[PDB]
Amino acid sequence: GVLKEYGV
Amino acid sequence: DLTAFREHFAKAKHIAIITGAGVSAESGVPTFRGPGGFWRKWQAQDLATPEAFSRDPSLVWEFYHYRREVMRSKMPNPAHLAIAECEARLGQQGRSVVIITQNIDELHHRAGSKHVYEIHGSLFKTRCMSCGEVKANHKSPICPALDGKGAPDPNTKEARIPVELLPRCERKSCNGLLRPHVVWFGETLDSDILTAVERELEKCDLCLVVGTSSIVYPAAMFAPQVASRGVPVAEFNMECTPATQKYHFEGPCGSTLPPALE
Ligand SMILES: [Zn+2]
């Protein structure tokens, strides 16, 4: 699943 | 070139509009990210995580309660309204408009938009940490223990509300602790929502990106897919582009968008 911000 | 954009607009049968924090900042709604984006000592990053909720759920609920309560005085802006009325008008003609929003403030709903994908959740939904049920909730205050709490001044003392008295699940045999139904930092977006968004993006023939950018996230996920179908993408945002620069209308979207979408 897609991390929000890409987990940035 | 507004006229060239409007030539595409006149013909478009399926418009996807992606919205970011710029459309909500212009309604007077703090993000808590960046300059002055403090609540007491903390910034959004520090609070919007499952680790904050696990270790201090009362503090995280005070923060979300504050935000819910502040929304009562904030109103949808001309950009939100243009988007909603555009959807209504085009829908009558059999033409489709869908909004894909990063924002959790529900302002698009208050504006009148129906076809909305809230990819980060909503300040006004809860999810039960026990049974998983999602429920809409606009109650002011969400529970009695939170009444009058959440003050944003850094020297405010913590409420330290016992977990039993925070918002609870009302299917009485469960009674689980509720959390905001918001995507937090380190959590995955809903797969079902993403599959719906992919279908809309794949069918659309014009895409607008409002109060964020095609190159930052979340917009960067979607917009390449549409651009690679050859579809025009139009940004409405305050950010500059070089002069050695598919459409960009620079400025506050509450000014630009009602003119572009009339
Ligand atoms: Zn429950």
Automatic annotation (TrEMBL), chain A:
Protein name, entry field: carbamoyl-phosphate synthase (ammonia)
The gene name on file is CPS1
